[PDB]
Amino acid sequence: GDKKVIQHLNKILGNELIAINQYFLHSRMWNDWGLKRLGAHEYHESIDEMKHADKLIERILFLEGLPNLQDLGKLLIGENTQEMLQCDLNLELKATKDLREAIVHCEQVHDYVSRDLLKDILESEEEHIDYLETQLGLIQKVGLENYLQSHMHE
Amino acid sequence: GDKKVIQHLNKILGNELIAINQYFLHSRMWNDWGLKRLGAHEYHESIDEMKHADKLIERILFLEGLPNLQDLGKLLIGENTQEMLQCDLNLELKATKDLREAIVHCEQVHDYVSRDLLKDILESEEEHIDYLETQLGLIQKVGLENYLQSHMHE
Amino acid sequence: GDKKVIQHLNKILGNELIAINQYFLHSRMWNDWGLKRLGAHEYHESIDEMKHADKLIERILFLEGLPNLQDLGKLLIGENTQEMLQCDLNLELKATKDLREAIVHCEQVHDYVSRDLLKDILESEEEHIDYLETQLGLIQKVGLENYLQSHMHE
Amino acid sequence: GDKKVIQHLNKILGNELIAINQYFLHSRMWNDWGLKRLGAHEYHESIDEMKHADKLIERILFLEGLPNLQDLGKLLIGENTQEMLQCDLNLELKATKDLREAIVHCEQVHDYVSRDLLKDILESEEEHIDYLETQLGLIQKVGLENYLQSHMHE
Amino acid sequence: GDKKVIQHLNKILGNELIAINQYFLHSRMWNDWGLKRLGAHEYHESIDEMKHADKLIERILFLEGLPNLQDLGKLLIGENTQEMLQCDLNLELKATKDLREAIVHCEQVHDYVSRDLLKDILESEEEHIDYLETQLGLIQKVGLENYLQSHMHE
Amino acid sequence: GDKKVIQHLNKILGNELIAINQYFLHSRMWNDWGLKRLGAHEYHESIDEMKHADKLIERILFLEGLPNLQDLGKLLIGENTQEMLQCDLNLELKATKDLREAIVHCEQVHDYVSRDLLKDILESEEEHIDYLETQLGLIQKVGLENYLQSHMHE
Amino acid sequence: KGDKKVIQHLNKILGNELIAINQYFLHSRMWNDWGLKRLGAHEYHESIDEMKHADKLIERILFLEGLPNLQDLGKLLIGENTQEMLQCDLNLELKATKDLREAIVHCEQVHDYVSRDLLKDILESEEEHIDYLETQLGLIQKVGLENYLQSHMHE
Ligand code: HEM
Ligand code: HEM
Ligand code: HEM
Ligand code: HEM
Ligand SMILES: [Fe+3]
Ligand SMILES: [Fe+3]
Ligand SMILES: [Fe+3]
Ligand SMILES: [Fe+3]
Ligand SMILES: [Fe+3]
Ligand SMILES: [Fe+3]
Ligand SMILES: [Fe+3]
Ligand SMILES: [Fe+3]
Ligand SMILES: [K+]
Ligand SMILES: [K+]
C-alpha cells in the first residue's frame, strides 16, 4: 500500500471522527431542547460518519497501514440551531476538500479501489451539504420560529 | 417497620396526591381549550402519579403503618398554559426535595427496599422535570402561539 | 352555566373524590390482608368513581365554572371487613341523596343534559348499594369466616 | 298524539333543516378555500343534523302529525372563518332554547319518549356548542393565521 | 475481591441453602397431606431460593473467592401448617437481617454491584415475608380448618 | 413401611444431596473458567440429582418416614478439570454401591416399588459413570488442552 | 441545575467511554483483518456497549445543564497481538471501574441518586466485561494460545 494513500486515508478518518462527535453532540442538544426532528436527523448523520470511519479503517488495515483513532481534531459546537447547522456545514466543506485531494492521489498511483471508496463517501458528504443548505435556506424562507416549530415532533 | 420512614412515605404519598388532582385538572383544562396534545400528556402524568400513590400505599401497609389519603395539600392551579406548566414544575421541585430527604433516612435505618421504591419514583419525577423545562424552553424558542398551535391535535 | 347547578356538580364531584380514596385504601387493605377478591372488586369501584369525577369535571368546565378538586371531606375508613362495607354503604347512601337533590335542581332550570349525566351516575351508585347490601346479607347467611374464605382468591 | 308536541317537533325540525343547509354550504366554502379540515368537520356537523331531521320526521309520522319540510328559515352565512363559526354558534344557541321548551312541554303532557328523543338531540347540539366555543377561543390563543393553517390539511 | 464481602456472600449463600431444603421439605409435606396449593406455592419459594444461591455463587467465583456449599445450617422443620409457616417466617426474618449487614459492608468498601445483587435478593425475601405474615393473618380471620380447606385444590 | 428401608432411602437421599451441591459447584466453576460446555453439562447433572431427591422425599414421606435434608456429607471438589471429573466419578462409584445394598434390602422385605425407584435411579447413575469414564478416556486420546478447547463453547 | 462536581465526574466517565469506544473498535477491526472473526465480533459488541453508555452520560449531563466534553481523547492502549489486546482492554476497565466508584460516592454525598443509579448500571456492565477478559486470558493458559485463537477464527 502506497504510503501517502494511507496518510490521506488517515486524514479522512480524522475528519470522520470529528463529525461523529460533533454530530452526535449536536443531536443530543437538539433533543434536550425538544427539537426531536433535528435530533433524529442529526443522529442519523452521525451514524453515517461512523460507517465511513469503519470502512476507512478496514481499508487501511488491508493496505497494511496503522489506523489512527488517537488524534481528535477540533469540534465545531454551535450554541443555537442556526450556528449548529453552519458549523456542520463548515466541517463538511472541509472534508469535501480533503476527499478531493485524496481521490487525486489515489488516481495518480493507480489505487482505484481506495478511489472508489472515497468517491462513495464524497457522494454522501455532498448529500449532507445539500440537506444543510436546504435547512439554512428554509429558515430564511419560513423564518426561524416556524422552522423550529416544524422540528419539534417526528 | 420503622416509624419515621413511614412518616416519610406518608409525606411522599401526600405529594403524589396533590400532583394527581393538579395534573388531572390541568389536563381537563387543556382539553376544554382545544389543546388536546397537552391535555393528553398531562393526563398521562396524572396517571403515572396515581401509580406511585398505589405503590406508596402498598409499601406503607406492608410496613404495618396507616396510609393517609385524608390530608390533601395545596393545588397550584395555573390559569394559562405558561402558569400551569410553571406550577407543575414548582410542585415537582418540592416533591423531588422530600424524595431525597426520605431516601437519606431509609439508607440511615437500612430500609433498602423503600429506598429503591423512592428512587424509582424519583427518576420518574426527574423525567417529568425534563419534560416541563423543555416545554418552557420551546415556548421561548418558537413563541407562545406556535407552541400552542403545535398542541391543538394529538 | 346556572350558578347553582355548578354548585350541585362541584358538590357531587366532592363526594366522588371522597369515594375514590376511601375505596382505594379499602382495596389495598383487603389486598394486604390476603382477601384479594374483595380488594379487586373494591379497586374497580374506586375506578368507577374516578370516571365519574372526570365526567363531572368536564361538564363543569364546559359550563364555564371552576371544578373544585381542592376540598376533601371525611373518609370513612373501617377496621374490619364488615365495617369497611358498612362505611362504603353510608357514603353511597349519602351520595345518592345529593344526587337526587341535584337532579331536582337541573330539572327546574332546564339543564336536561346535566340531569342526564347525574341520572347515569345515580344508577351506577344504586348498583354499588345493591352489591354492598348483598354482601352484608351474605355474611349473615354463610357466616363471617365462610364469607371471607370465599374472598381470598380471584 | 298531542297537537302541541307535534308543533314543537315541527319547530325543532325547522331548526335542523336550516342547520343542514347552513353547515353544508360552510363546509363547501371552507373546502373551496383549501381549509379542508374545517370543511370535513363541518360536513359531519351537517350530516348529524340530517340524522336528527330523520329521527324527528319518523316521530311526527308515528304520532300522526304532518312533517313540515317546506318552511326553511334564515341561513346564517358567514364570509370568513370567524363569521362562519359565530353564525353556527348563534344558530345553535337559538336551537338549544327551542329544544328546552319542547322538552318542558313533552314532560307536561307525559310524552316521555319524545322528551327522550329531544334530550339526545339536545346533548348533541351542546357538543356542537363546545366545539364552536373552543375554536373561537383557539383563534384568540394561537392567532387567526396559525389557526387557519392548522386547518388546511386533514 | 474484598475479603469481608465474600464472607458476607458466603453467609447469605448459607441462608439460601437452609431455605432451599426447608422450603422444599415443607412443600412435599404439604403435598403428602393433600394441601396441594400450599405444596405448589412452597415449591416455587424453594425454587426462588435456588436462583438466589446460583447468583451468589456466580458472584463469589467472579470475585475469586471460594463458594461454601459444604456447611449446611440448621433447618426449621415444622410439624403442622401453622408451625411450618412460622418457621419459614423466622428463617426469613433472620436472613433479612444478614442481608442488611452485607449491604452496609458492600456500600462501605464501594462494592456497589454486590450491593445491588443483595438489594434484589432482599426485596424478594421481603415479598416472601408478606406472603407469610398474610397467611398467618388469614388463619385468624377464616379459621384454621377453612384455611387448609382453601388450599387443597390448585 | 419397613424401618430399615427408610434408612436406606435417607442414605441414598444423603448421597443425592451431596452430588447436587458438588455438581452445582463444579458447574459454576467451569462457567467461571469459560468452559461452558462442561459447565452446562455439569449443571444438567445437578438437576438430575435434584429430581432423584425429590422422588426419594416423596416416597419416604408416603412410607411415613422422616426425610433427612439436614446432614450434608463430604463434598469432593476438584481444583482442575481432571480432578473434578475424577471426584464426580468417585462419588458416583460410592452411590452405585449404596443403591445396590438398598435394592437387596427392598427385595428381601418385599418393598418392590421402592426397589423399582432405586433401580431407575441406578440406571441413571450408571449413565453418568459412562459419561465420566468416557470424558477421562477422551483426555488421554486427544490431550487435555484439546479436550478443554472442545468444551469452551456451547 | 445539577451539582458541578457530579458533572465533572460525569464528563470524566464519559471521557473513559470515548477511549474504550475507539480502543475496542480498532481491536475489533484488527482481529478481523487477522481472520480472528469471533474475537472481532465480540469486541465490536463491546465497542457498541460503550457508545451506549456514552449516550446516556451525554443525556444526563445536558439534563443537569452541564457541557458534555467529547473533545479530549485520553490515551488508547493498542496491543499488537491478541494477548496484549485483551490485557490492554483489561487495564482500561480497571481504570474505568475505579473512576466510576469515586463518582458514585460523590453522588451519594450530594444526594443525586438518579445519577448514582445510572453509574451503577454502567459499572455493572464494565464488571461483566472484566469477567470476560479475565476468562479469555485464563483460557489462553488452559488450552494454549494457538488452540485459543483457533477457536476464534469462525463465528
Ligand atoms: C387516591 C387517589 C387516586 C388513586 C390512588 C388512583 C389510582 C388509579 C390507578 C392505580 C389507576 C390505573 C392506571 C392504569 O390504567 O394502569 C387509575 C386510573 C384512572 N384514574 Fe385514578 N387514582 C386516584 C385519583 C383519581 C382522581 C382524582 C381522578 C380524577 C378524575 C382519577 C381518574 C382516573 C381515570 C379516568 C383512570 C382511567 C381508568 C380507566 O379508564 O380504565 N383518579 N387511577
Ligand atoms: C342541502 C341539502 C342536503 C345536502 C346537500 C345533503 C348532502 C348529503 C350527502 C353528500 C350525503 C352522503 C351520502 C353518501 O354519499 O352516501 C348525505 C346523507 C344523508 N342525508 Fe343529506 N343532504 C341534504 C339534505 C338532507 C335532508 C333534508 C335530509 C332529511 C333527513 C337528509 C338526510 C340524510 C341522511 C339520513 C343521510 C345518511 C346519513 C347516514 O350516513 O346515516 N339530507 N346528505
Ligand atoms: C434439597 C435439595 C434440592 C432439591 C430437592 C432440588 C430440586 C429441584 C427440582 C425438582 C427442580 C425442577 C427441575 C425441573 O423440573 O426441570 C429444581 C430446579 C433448579 N435448582 Fe434445585 N434442588 C435442590 C438443591 C439445589 C441447589 C443447592 C441449587 C444451587 C445450589 C439448586 C439450583 C437449581 C436451579 C438453578 C434450578 C432451575 C430453576 C429454574 O427452572 O429456573 N437446587 N430443583
Ligand atoms: C461519539 C462517540 C460515539 C457515540 C456516542 C456513538 C454512539 C452510537 C450509538 C448510540 C449507536 C447505536 C447503537 C445501537 O443501538 O445499535 C452507534 C452505532 C454504531 N457506531 Fe457509534 N458512537 C460513537 C463513536 C463511534 C466510532 C468511533 C465508531 C467507529 C470507529 C462507531 C461505529 C459505529 C457503528 C459501525 C455502529 C452500527 C451502525 C449501524 O449498523 O446502524 N461509533 N453508535
Ligand atoms: Fe424538516
Ligand atoms: Fe410537544
Ligand atoms: Fe382542529
Ligand atoms: Fe363474592
Ligand atoms: Fe390462599
Ligand atoms: Fe396543501
Ligand atoms: Fe380432592
Ligand atoms: Fe469464545
Ligand atoms: K406556525
Ligand atoms: K367453608
mmCIF file of N, CA and C in Angstrom, chain E residues 22-85:
data_model
loop_
_atom_site.group_PDB
_atom_site.id
_atom_site.type_symbol
_atom_site.label_atom_id
_atom_site.label_comp_id
_atom_site.label_asym_id
_atom_site.label_seq_id
_atom_site.Cartn_x
_atom_site.Cartn_y
_atom_site.Cartn_z
ATOM 1 N N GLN E 22 -35.409 -26.392 53.548
ATOM 2 C CA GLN E 22 -36.557 -26.242 54.409
ATOM 3 C C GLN E 22 -37.833 -26.108 53.560
ATOM 4 N N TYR E 23 -37.799 -25.212 52.565
ATOM 5 C CA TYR E 23 -38.998 -24.921 51.812
ATOM 6 C C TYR E 23 -39.366 -26.126 50.974
ATOM 7 N N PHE E 24 -38.375 -26.814 50.471
ATOM 8 C CA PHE E 24 -38.669 -27.986 49.691
ATOM 9 C C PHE E 24 -39.308 -29.096 50.486
ATOM 10 N N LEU E 25 -38.762 -29.379 51.668
ATOM 11 C CA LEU E 25 -39.328 -30.404 52.533
ATOM 12 C C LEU E 25 -40.770 -30.012 52.943
ATOM 13 N N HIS E 26 -40.952 -28.755 53.334
ATOM 14 C CA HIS E 26 -42.260 -28.268 53.666
ATOM 15 C C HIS E 26 -43.217 -28.435 52.464
ATOM 16 N N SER E 27 -42.755 -28.096 51.264
ATOM 17 C CA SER E 27 -43.520 -28.371 50.038
ATOM 18 C C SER E 27 -44.014 -29.828 49.878
ATOM 19 N N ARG E 28 -43.126 -30.812 50.006
ATOM 20 C CA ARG E 28 -43.547 -32.210 49.810
ATOM 21 C C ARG E 28 -44.416 -32.696 50.939
ATOM 22 N N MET E 29 -44.216 -32.082 52.115
ATOM 23 C CA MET E 29 -45.016 -32.412 53.286
ATOM 24 C C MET E 29 -46.438 -32.011 53.001
ATOM 25 N N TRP E 30 -46.629 -30.770 52.570
ATOM 26 C CA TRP E 30 -47.985 -30.339 52.223
ATOM 27 C C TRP E 30 -48.627 -31.156 51.081
ATOM 28 N N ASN E 31 -47.854 -31.601 50.096
ATOM 29 C CA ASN E 31 -48.463 -32.425 49.027
ATOM 30 C C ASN E 31 -48.877 -33.754 49.575
ATOM 31 N N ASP E 32 -47.992 -34.350 50.353
ATOM 32 C CA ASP E 32 -48.281 -35.588 51.022
ATOM 33 C C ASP E 32 -49.581 -35.498 51.750
ATOM 34 N N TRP E 33 -49.831 -34.363 52.398
ATOM 35 C CA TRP E 33 -51.081 -34.131 53.143
ATOM 36 C C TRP E 33 -52.293 -33.757 52.269
ATOM 37 N N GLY E 34 -52.053 -33.441 50.999
ATOM 38 C CA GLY E 34 -53.160 -33.243 50.064
ATOM 39 C C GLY E 34 -53.555 -31.791 49.950
ATOM 40 N N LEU E 35 -52.693 -30.946 50.527
ATOM 41 C CA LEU E 35 -52.776 -29.486 50.531
ATOM 42 C C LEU E 35 -51.885 -28.942 49.432
ATOM 43 N N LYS E 36 -52.347 -29.163 48.206
ATOM 44 C CA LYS E 36 -51.526 -29.030 47.012
ATOM 45 C C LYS E 36 -51.215 -27.570 46.622
ATOM 46 N N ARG E 37 -52.035 -26.657 47.074
ATOM 47 C CA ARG E 37 -51.831 -25.273 46.761
ATOM 48 C C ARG E 37 -50.765 -24.688 47.645
ATOM 49 N N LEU E 38 -50.625 -25.219 48.848
ATOM 50 C CA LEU E 38 -49.549 -24.781 49.714
ATOM 51 C C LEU E 38 -48.284 -25.444 49.223
ATOM 52 N N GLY E 39 -48.359 -26.750 48.941
ATOM 53 C CA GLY E 39 -47.244 -27.505 48.377
ATOM 54 C C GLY E 39 -46.653 -26.803 47.171
ATOM 55 N N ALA E 40 -47.502 -26.459 46.202
ATOM 56 C CA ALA E 40 -47.045 -25.762 44.995
ATOM 57 C C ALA E 40 -46.469 -24.375 45.257
ATOM 58 N N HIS E 41 -47.090 -23.583 46.112
ATOM 59 C CA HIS E 41 -46.505 -22.272 46.408
ATOM 60 C C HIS E 41 -45.130 -22.447 47.077
ATOM 61 N N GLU E 42 -45.018 -23.414 47.969
ATOM 62 C CA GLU E 42 -43.815 -23.557 48.760
ATOM 63 C C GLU E 42 -42.677 -24.066 47.873
ATOM 64 N N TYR E 43 -43.028 -24.947 46.941
ATOM 65 C CA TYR E 43 -42.102 -25.392 45.911
ATOM 66 C C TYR E 43 -41.524 -24.207 45.136
ATOM 67 N N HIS E 44 -42.370 -23.287 44.679
ATOM 68 C CA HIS E 44 -41.827 -22.118 43.982
ATOM 69 C C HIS E 44 -40.961 -21.223 44.904
ATOM 70 N N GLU E 45 -41.290 -21.102 46.202
ATOM 71 C CA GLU E 45 -40.400 -20.385 47.116
ATOM 72 C C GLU E 45 -39.008 -21.064 47.138
ATOM 73 N N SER E 46 -39.014 -22.398 47.260
ATOM 74 C CA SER E 46 -37.799 -23.200 47.227
ATOM 75 C C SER E 46 -37.017 -22.933 45.946
ATOM 76 N N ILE E 47 -37.693 -23.002 44.802
ATOM 77 C CA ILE E 47 -37.031 -22.736 43.521
ATOM 78 C C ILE E 47 -36.394 -21.345 43.521
ATOM 79 N N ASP E 48 -37.167 -20.334 43.913
ATOM 80 C CA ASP E 48 -36.650 -18.970 44.022
ATOM 81 C C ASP E 48 -35.323 -18.911 44.815
ATOM 82 N N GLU E 49 -35.189 -19.749 45.845
ATOM 83 C CA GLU E 49 -34.046 -19.586 46.705
ATOM 84 C C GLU E 49 -32.848 -20.182 46.003
ATOM 85 N N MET E 50 -33.037 -21.320 45.339
ATOM 86 C CA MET E 50 -32.034 -21.860 44.380
ATOM 87 C C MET E 50 -31.450 -20.801 43.414
ATOM 88 N N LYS E 51 -32.303 -19.947 42.841
ATOM 89 C CA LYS E 51 -31.827 -18.928 41.866
ATOM 90 C C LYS E 51 -30.936 -17.880 42.498
ATOM 91 N N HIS E 52 -31.312 -17.512 43.716
ATOM 92 C CA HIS E 52 -30.529 -16.648 44.578
ATOM 93 C C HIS E 52 -29.178 -17.287 44.964
ATOM 94 N N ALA E 53 -29.190 -18.557 45.365
ATOM 95 C CA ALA E 53 -27.953 -19.259 45.597
ATOM 96 C C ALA E 53 -27.055 -19.167 44.376
ATOM 97 N N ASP E 54 -27.574 -19.574 43.230
ATOM 98 C CA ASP E 54 -26.805 -19.609 41.985
ATOM 99 C C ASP E 54 -26.133 -18.288 41.702
ATOM 100 N N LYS E 55 -26.922 -17.218 41.703
ATOM 101 C CA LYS E 55 -26.392 -15.865 41.526
ATOM 102 C C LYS E 55 -25.296 -15.555 42.515
ATOM 103 N N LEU E 56 -25.425 -16.032 43.762
ATOM 104 C CA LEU E 56 -24.393 -15.735 44.772
ATOM 105 C C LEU E 56 -23.123 -16.428 44.419
ATOM 106 N N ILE E 57 -23.239 -17.700 44.089
ATOM 107 C CA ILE E 57 -22.128 -18.498 43.666
ATOM 108 C C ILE E 57 -21.397 -17.880 42.468
ATOM 109 N N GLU E 58 -22.146 -17.425 41.482
ATOM 110 C CA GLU E 58 -21.508 -16.878 40.289
ATOM 111 C C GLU E 58 -20.674 -15.672 40.668
ATOM 112 N N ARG E 59 -21.212 -14.867 41.589
ATOM 113 C CA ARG E 59 -20.564 -13.629 42.049
ATOM 114 C C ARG E 59 -19.274 -13.878 42.829
ATOM 115 N N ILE E 60 -19.339 -14.856 43.721
ATOM 116 C CA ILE E 60 -18.215 -15.193 44.589
ATOM 117 C C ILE E 60 -17.094 -15.664 43.715
ATOM 118 N N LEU E 61 -17.385 -16.672 42.914
ATOM 119 C CA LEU E 61 -16.444 -17.137 41.933
ATOM 120 C C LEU E 61 -15.882 -15.975 41.176
ATOM 121 N N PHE E 62 -16.704 -14.998 40.815
ATOM 122 C CA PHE E 62 -16.196 -13.905 39.979
ATOM 123 C C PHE E 62 -15.221 -13.098 40.795
ATOM 124 N N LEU E 63 -15.520 -12.909 42.075
ATOM 125 C CA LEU E 63 -14.621 -12.153 42.959
ATOM 126 C C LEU E 63 -13.496 -13.056 43.447
ATOM 127 N N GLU E 64 -13.253 -14.120 42.701
ATOM 128 C CA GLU E 64 -12.161 -15.011 43.010
ATOM 129 C C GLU E 64 -12.199 -15.568 44.416
ATOM 130 N N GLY E 65 -13.297 -15.394 45.140
ATOM 131 C CA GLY E 65 -13.480 -16.087 46.413
ATOM 132 C C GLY E 65 -13.911 -17.518 46.151
ATOM 133 N N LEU E 66 -13.992 -18.305 47.228
ATOM 134 C CA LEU E 66 -14.370 -19.732 47.205
ATOM 135 C C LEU E 66 -15.785 -19.985 47.790
ATOM 136 N N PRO E 67 -16.742 -20.428 46.946
ATOM 137 C CA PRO E 67 -18.101 -20.731 47.431
ATOM 138 C C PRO E 67 -18.200 -21.897 48.426
ATOM 139 N N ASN E 68 -18.876 -21.638 49.534
ATOM 140 C CA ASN E 68 -19.120 -22.635 50.535
ATOM 141 C C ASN E 68 -20.496 -23.296 50.454
ATOM 142 N N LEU E 69 -20.574 -24.448 49.802
ATOM 143 C CA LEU E 69 -21.809 -25.219 49.807
ATOM 144 C C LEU E 69 -21.654 -26.401 50.749
ATOM 145 N N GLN E 70 -20.573 -26.404 51.529
ATOM 146 C CA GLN E 70 -20.296 -27.548 52.429
ATOM 147 C C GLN E 70 -21.039 -27.505 53.759
ATOM 148 N N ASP E 71 -21.124 -26.326 54.368
ATOM 149 C CA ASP E 71 -21.732 -26.186 55.697
ATOM 150 C C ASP E 71 -23.215 -25.838 55.608
ATOM 151 N N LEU E 72 -24.073 -26.765 56.002
ATOM 152 C CA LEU E 72 -25.497 -26.509 55.973
ATOM 153 C C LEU E 72 -25.935 -26.165 57.400
ATOM 154 N N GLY E 73 -26.500 -24.972 57.591
ATOM 155 C CA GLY E 73 -27.018 -24.578 58.887
ATOM 156 C C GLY E 73 -28.163 -25.471 59.352
ATOM 157 N N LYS E 74 -28.883 -24.999 60.360
ATOM 158 C CA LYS E 74 -29.937 -25.798 60.948
ATOM 159 C C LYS E 74 -31.293 -25.523 60.228
ATOM 160 N N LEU E 75 -31.942 -26.578 59.745
ATOM 161 C CA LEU E 75 -33.295 -26.472 59.219
ATOM 162 C C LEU E 75 -34.304 -26.166 60.343
ATOM 163 N N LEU E 76 -35.421 -25.509 60.027
ATOM 164 C CA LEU E 76 -36.540 -25.339 60.966
ATOM 165 C C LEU E 76 -37.750 -26.072 60.406
ATOM 166 N N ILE E 77 -37.864 -27.375 60.645
ATOM 167 C CA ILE E 77 -38.921 -28.154 60.019
ATOM 168 C C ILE E 77 -40.152 -28.170 60.897
ATOM 169 N N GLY E 78 -41.225 -27.524 60.472
ATOM 170 C CA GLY E 78 -42.465 -27.554 61.244
ATOM 171 C C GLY E 78 -43.132 -28.908 61.191
ATOM 172 N N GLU E 79 -44.242 -29.052 61.900
ATOM 173 C CA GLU E 79 -44.859 -30.347 62.124
ATOM 174 C C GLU E 79 -46.330 -30.309 61.758
ATOM 175 N N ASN E 80 -46.845 -29.096 61.601
ATOM 176 C CA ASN E 80 -48.164 -28.818 61.020
ATOM 177 C C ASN E 80 -48.127 -27.443 60.282
ATOM 178 N N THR E 81 -49.208 -27.081 59.590
ATOM 179 C CA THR E 81 -49.198 -25.907 58.717
ATOM 180 C C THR E 81 -48.792 -24.626 59.456
ATOM 181 N N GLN E 82 -49.508 -24.342 60.544
ATOM 182 C CA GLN E 82 -49.239 -23.124 61.296
ATOM 183 C C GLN E 82 -47.743 -23.043 61.592
ATOM 184 N N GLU E 83 -47.179 -24.160 62.021
ATOM 185 C CA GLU E 83 -45.817 -24.160 62.505
ATOM 186 C C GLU E 83 -44.820 -24.018 61.349
ATOM 187 N N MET E 84 -45.070 -24.755 60.269
ATOM 188 C CA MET E 84 -44.313 -24.591 59.026
ATOM 189 C C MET E 84 -44.253 -23.114 58.500
ATOM 190 N N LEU E 85 -45.390 -22.449 58.407
ATOM 191 C CA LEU E 85 -45.369 -21.033 58.040
ATOM 192 C C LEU E 85 -44.481 -20.214 58.966
#
